[PDB]
Symmetry: D2
Subunit: 485 residues, 4 copies
Amino acid sequence: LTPDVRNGIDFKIADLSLADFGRKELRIAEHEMPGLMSLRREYAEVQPLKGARISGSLHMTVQTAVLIETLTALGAEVRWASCNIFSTQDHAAAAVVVGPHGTPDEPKGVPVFAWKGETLEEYWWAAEQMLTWPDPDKPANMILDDGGDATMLVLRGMQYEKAGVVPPAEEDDPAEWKVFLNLLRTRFETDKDKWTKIAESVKGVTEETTTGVLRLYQFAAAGDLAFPAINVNDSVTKSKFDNKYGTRHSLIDGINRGTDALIGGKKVLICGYGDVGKGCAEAMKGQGARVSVTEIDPINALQAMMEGFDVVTVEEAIGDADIVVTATGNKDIIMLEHIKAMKDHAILGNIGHFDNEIDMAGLERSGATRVNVKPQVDLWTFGDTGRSIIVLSEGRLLNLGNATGHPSFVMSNSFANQTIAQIELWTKNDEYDNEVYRLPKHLDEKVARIHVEALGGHLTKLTKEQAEYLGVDVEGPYKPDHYRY
Amino acid sequence: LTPDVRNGIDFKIADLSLADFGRKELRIAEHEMPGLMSLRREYAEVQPLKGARISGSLHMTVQTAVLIETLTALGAEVRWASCNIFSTQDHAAAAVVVGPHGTPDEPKGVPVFAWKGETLEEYWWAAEQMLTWPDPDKPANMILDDGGDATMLVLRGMQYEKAGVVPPAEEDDPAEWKVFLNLLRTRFETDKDKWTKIAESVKGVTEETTTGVLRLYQFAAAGDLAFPAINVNDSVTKSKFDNKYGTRHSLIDGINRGTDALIGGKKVLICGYGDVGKGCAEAMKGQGARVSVTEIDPINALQAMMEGFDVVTVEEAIGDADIVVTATGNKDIIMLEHIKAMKDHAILGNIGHFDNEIDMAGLERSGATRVNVKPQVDLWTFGDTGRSIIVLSEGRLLNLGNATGHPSFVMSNSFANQTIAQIELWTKNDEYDNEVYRLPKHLDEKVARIHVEALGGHLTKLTKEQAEYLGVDVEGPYKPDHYRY
Amino acid sequence: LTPDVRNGIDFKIADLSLADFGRKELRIAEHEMPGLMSLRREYAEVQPLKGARISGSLHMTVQTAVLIETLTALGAEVRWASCNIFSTQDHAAAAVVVGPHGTPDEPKGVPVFAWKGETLEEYWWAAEQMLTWPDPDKPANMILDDGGDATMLVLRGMQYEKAGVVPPAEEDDPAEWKVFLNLLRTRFETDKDKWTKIAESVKGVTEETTTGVLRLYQFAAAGDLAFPAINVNDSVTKSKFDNKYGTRHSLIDGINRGTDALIGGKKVLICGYGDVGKGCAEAMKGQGARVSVTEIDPINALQAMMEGFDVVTVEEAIGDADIVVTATGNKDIIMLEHIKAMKDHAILGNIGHFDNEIDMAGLERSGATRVNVKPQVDLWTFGDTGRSIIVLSEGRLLNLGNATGHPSFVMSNSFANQTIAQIELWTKNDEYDNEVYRLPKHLDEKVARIHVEALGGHLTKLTKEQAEYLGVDVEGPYKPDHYRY
Amino acid sequence: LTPDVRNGIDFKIADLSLADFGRKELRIAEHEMPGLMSLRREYAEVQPLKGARISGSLHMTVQTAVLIETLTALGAEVRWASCNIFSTQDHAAAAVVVGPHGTPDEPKGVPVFAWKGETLEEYWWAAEQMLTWPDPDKPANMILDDGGDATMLVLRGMQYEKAGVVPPAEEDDPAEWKVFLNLLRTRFETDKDKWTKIAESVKGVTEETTTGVLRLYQFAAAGDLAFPAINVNDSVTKSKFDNKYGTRHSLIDGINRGTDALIGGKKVLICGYGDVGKGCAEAMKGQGARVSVTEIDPINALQAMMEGFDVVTVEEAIGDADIVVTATGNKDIIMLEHIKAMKDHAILGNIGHFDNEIDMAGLERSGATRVNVKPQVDLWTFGDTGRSIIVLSEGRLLNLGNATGHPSFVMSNSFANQTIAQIELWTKNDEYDNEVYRLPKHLDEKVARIHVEALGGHLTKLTKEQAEYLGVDVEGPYKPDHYRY
Ligand SMILES: NC(=O)c1ccc[n+]([C@@H]2O[C@H](COP(=O)([O-])OP(=O)(O)OC[C@H]3O[C@@H](n4cnc5c(N)ncnc54)[C@H](O)[C@@H]3O)[C@@H](O)[C@H]2O)c1
Ligand SMILES: NC(=O)c1ccc[n+]([C@@H]2O[C@H](COP(=O)([O-])OP(=O)(O)OC[C@H]3O[C@@H](n4cnc5c(N)ncnc54)[C@H](O)[C@@H]3O)[C@@H](O)[C@H]2O)c1
Ligand SMILES: Nc1ncnc2c1ncn2[C@@H]1CC(CO)C(=O)[C@H]1O
């Protein structure tokens, strides 16, 4: 595995000749991303990210391409990889390397190391490529992360360097961990302070998703967070719109392309009822499914029941479920005994960040036989019961695996928030300690306002007396800090 | 007006002979309020509220009666009044005075000053009764408030005593403000220190609703909050359940009893899309309404659009609305000009805490003529256009004015939070400063767990491995502090 | 029991002084009933109902009152009674007897024999009063019927007159059949051809509901239909709108006023998924209920599954239902064995035409004890289990018994169909045989058009080319005769 | 163009090597089509279609593949073509040619003339191939039709042979009409009575869709219906399930794959509110869209209003619509003038049987310019306004053109009906005249029962007393002939 180089740009992608297709969809997406397009306009003169060297680890989609090109319009240099082995849209990756005025023979874009259907070894090689800038005097100085893999590589890397050794993996370790440690160990043989130096160069990280935010909280509580982080997941305009309405769009899209199964009339088990599980349940309910929900949290469980759903355990419900979706951000939700309990020709997938919600290692070592139907759709048969289960995307987040993830208008919210966070952390870096921050409410309301306007909504303007009555400025922010929407 | 006294209990209510009917509905309600019944059992031996003398200002309904009888079961003495002129359920008021083992001839319950259809003057006389305990050496030492009227009475009262004069009112003050000052001004002529003594005796206030919580944040900003306060509105199990799913139930109930108007096929305008407006929109949508929404907050506005509703102004939409509902907690939403814009036989109501959302003073002074249809339903005719508007509850919150407010199972959440807050504030008073607090998450989780259990929900339990992965205890709390559900 | 007579009108109602309150709601209802009002204008000069002496058996509500004064506006003379012992709105009965221009002292309306809370004896008495015109040479010449009770009295009465004997009642016959036969037997002692002469005078019947229609098909198949009948239920604008959307409104209204039980979060069982069951399920779903459905018809069952509802038997679901509603038009749906299986404080009600959907007779003889809570709400308790059930309206149709039935706007559809059917049979009587007929499609479209317009719907007009391509006239009808909508 | 031949099969498909993939999807579909599988078993020994030579014109999808191998399993020979240029799934075509036991090199399936993306020339050539059986001598004896193109070819073809002349194309009128006449006139040169003889030979036709049924009523009314026809569309289990629920599934799938446009928050315009329009509205609403509906029929319009949708004309709503879908079965819905009024990047599509709902010919002549994005997705730009429109599938039914059409479980209803009608007409042919017939109710109930059971629905069985009460047999049918569900 060696990078391709064309016109001084290193990259590794499926097919550069897809760029023309990619560029057409990027141009359509620009129309549906008023959040990103409005920031390009506002900040074009300013060039706020001049001097930034952004290493981004985030699903390489059409929507992420509009994000990358917003960061470049604003002055940044970037290097990119996908944060999932199946989530890259190859036409979009091609268009990013080529750029808006380039061609396949004369590319003018940025380094991308991403393609749909990477191996675990390829996935971590690409991550390192993305994190490794060409000039050893000029390493990465910002991270843009989705799920924390980039942050993990730099932070665990420095840890092993400081300790003089990369540990062995245990044989019972998850495959991906073994792959990951192998990369660190191999690099340690030839370069002894790689990750330490990169960690000292990173000015901040912006983290897009619930799972990665959890991991940041875990680093920070260990005293191991080496630079400022902005939790972009928990922008109101992100968590409450992307995780919820995005999923409401793209869950059924993933299931449609993977299976073409009728959803109406089917028993559907959704595991977890946070923002993700809420959109799942709503999408399924809208299509005529009979939905039940699982939960550990009594508050989220009570919401599920008030929304018309039984709240049940996997053990009691799994045998009746026509479709099973894991939405928890936890591990060990659907174990091999659960999968063996499923009815014949039931569908199983995961829409949480990591594949470990489903016991895929157990199913693979089970003695069940695998028949591939098409990309990211496998029929698994158990010889002892004779029952076959359809598994989507090998357990990896199925909306991006089997379809195209959330729609542009939704990602416009999430990516306007990331762009704002990148701009804040870069230009105002000396206002942040080595802690996890969220964006102020006035910026979340700014992102909302752009999208209401684009949809044709008419906001009401408070009169002077009304603002005084509420104790707010006419221009916001409108809600107290703990307000939950 | 003078109180009635029977068997040493002072009260003022419509009809003590309604006690038998009241008791029946209280007993039914006990079955639908596991949150309150669970607290009675748990704290029965402890008697945590022994010594408390709670002045309660809160809609005197069946649900409130079960709350009162929880506080007395747990050791408190109470005196009660309603926080709205139209919200009392007379049978429930009678049952509280009589108590579970009393009769109308031998009552064994608590002082209540409340009936449906109070005048403004009577409303404020009753609050004064409720706040004035019989032994001058043993004044109120706890307030339980809904909308802040009791708290306002004590704090403005003490303010004017400290100043040595009660302000005169301006001719352009609302009627209710004039009434309120008249009360304080009258009492100050014969008792110069009444409210100061009460204010010093009060060890804390618990506050049930958004409007009241705002007024608390406004007092604490002014240097003027004399005792700790718990913000019960913003327990997750209150705001996200009472304000939303409560209103989903009781908005259409109030409209039904008042008008029997078909909702399917009608255009409905909901002003505000916070928790209350969300419930409103959801109920109306479920009945086949064509719902549009008004908002000042682009985040809430963007949620409304994502839920299938146009976001519009009162100015553009008012002429087309079959039904108009204010849900803002703000004032001056529907002014005289808007009411005159409304189509013939359109319906107008408020479900926010105070009647000032609608310009009732302007309508009553306008020269429109009023025909009363039935209690809390009035038909107003404008002579110049010839159009008639149906107004519900004279602008007072219509769910409680035209119907019975939220159902028992919902109030059980709110009132379990209220009871917990009373217990915490009473038994641990020294741990609190003169600030607004919210309950810790683990107590909101406790409340939710009781109700999930009661409905037949089955919670999943985290393994030690899962809990470690998530950074949580197996027993909660399960979410970070800023989690919005 | 003896009729009152006042100013030349015989009647028996609760209270004439309710006339003013009734008249206000009648005038409000007129605005919500453009189907009826349009007909009054269209047929004002024509007087198509001159000569007609109409005996109506139909729930004496505000809506029926506007139907009555439409019939009189078009020339008819009427006599009225209700078709249910709990469905009369006493204020509407008073306004009908009084008239738009009468007073309680000098009434100028029509004979009404109806009040809320009739006994079975009083009910059948009133139905005889309604079918018995004062001049014996001018008997009833038309029937307007709901449930088929008036038609049954006339046709059975004649049958027993011809047989020379009214047969004794069987011991295990329902209480009401015993009362119905008493009425006939007692009248037959003194008047040997009363019902023959009325049945010979009746030119036609119009039947407004599914149950009455079934009985008309039954009479006609025995060769006992003495006059032509119009099936008004099966007009598209009746069945698809009244039975379905009317019920979506009034089912939850009845349950609210009777119990104030939270619907969200609760398990609800609907028996039957015809138009009524469909309306029930949708209402319940819209409020956050977890709905299951029972059915004998696999077509209606498949629809319910496609609509997100488990299809289940009474036996499997009864134990866990919080609310149970029967909507089948059939008998013996919830038997005593089921009621004994129900959970503590579960709610039981019927919304089909007759109370025999529920085994009330079994419950009354079971040894369960009854506590009345308020009118049409009874708590029944089994000492053996200690569990209690709330029964609504003694198993009588709960929407009209616990609330006000369907809203004016919906009833406007049904009652325009009935007015048109009355006109058609009266004026074109010799065009009909003694069979059951449905109105022609263009008259259904006519009724629909009126209400689309009233709601602000904008119809598109076919071009000449389009209408030719579809094979229809620009003015309709637009659908083939078997079209199901 | 010339058919391929391998191993005694003539065919014309994209690629035989796609058989393996096709066969996997076919085996998955068999599990989702219990209506078809139940019929294979029921009639396996009987072989009811022995002797039938069926010419089927129907979208060549995985579902139709399972119907084809049902017909052959039952003793028929078949020849197949798709009824739309874009709706063929190429891998299903290959699996049908190859058969369940053949190889790409020695196929053991049946003749198929179909690929995704035919020209109008190719479509009509394929239609002729499908209708022309190899033995002179032994021509088609059964037609299975969808849209009525096959029937039109046979019946109009005969009409010109009786006249002795195929008329001139003309300068204008549709481009497709020209192709159709061209094909006929070319054949008339060499074979003077081809179509007369095929028509004489055809015993009956089964017609799958509303549009083709309308065209049958048009032929029959002319007196030109040459053989018996079964109207399959209007089986209750077809129209109320396929047209409504299948569309609810496949409309958003089409739009998703074509555009990935967010549906939530967008204004959507659905033209027509019959079964397809119903399903369209419901899908969009479930995804959070703001839906409006157009109609010519006041009954259907009144339904849409009661379902929460404004009823509007194209002219009033076109300017603000984000997405526009035609679902009428009529022509000239969205004319060029409308397309010019649409907003920038609005999406336009048709889901009715034919493309003429949308003025494609006017668009193509208007001077707007087309950029192809990917197959069945075109961006058209008007240089005068600078605004662009996305058009799906060149205005052909978008669900099959941009995705996969309705799911197998849905198609299992329609295709069980089709198979049954084919058995009825083939085995009981002498009992039918040259008229349009619908299947009896018991057969509809039969189909629904299979799917209810498949989904785990549990029907209740009437007692003998209940069935007596309703006037029905325990085994059904349960409803009167005119019942609308
Ligand atoms: N009747 C009841 O049973 C009941 C139940 C709960 C709460 N309440 C009361 O309801 C009110 C609202 O409560 P909430 O929890 O929804 O509060 P909230 O703050 O969540 O929602 C109010 C919304 O109104 C909007 N708003 C403010 N001024 C406006 C204006 N001029 N026009 C349009 N929108 C505007 C705000 O942007 C906000 O999102 C408060 O008065 C509260 O005490 C009543
Ligand atoms: N794409 C698919 O998978 C699919 C499935 C089933 C049916 N169809 C096709 O869809 C079309 C519609 O089918 P249907 O079963 O809903 O028919 P339908 O007759 O039940 O409904 C069509 C509706 O269009 C309305 N309409 C007609 N002309 C109109 C106009 N100018 N403006 C506004 N509204 C108008 C009619 O009043 C009618 O109610 C037919 O072509 C049918 O063959 C397609
Ligand atoms: N039945 C009911 N009993 C008592 N309180 C009720 C009821 N229904 C709603 N509420 C209150 C009213 C309010 C604003 O004043 C709230 O916040 C609530 O929770």
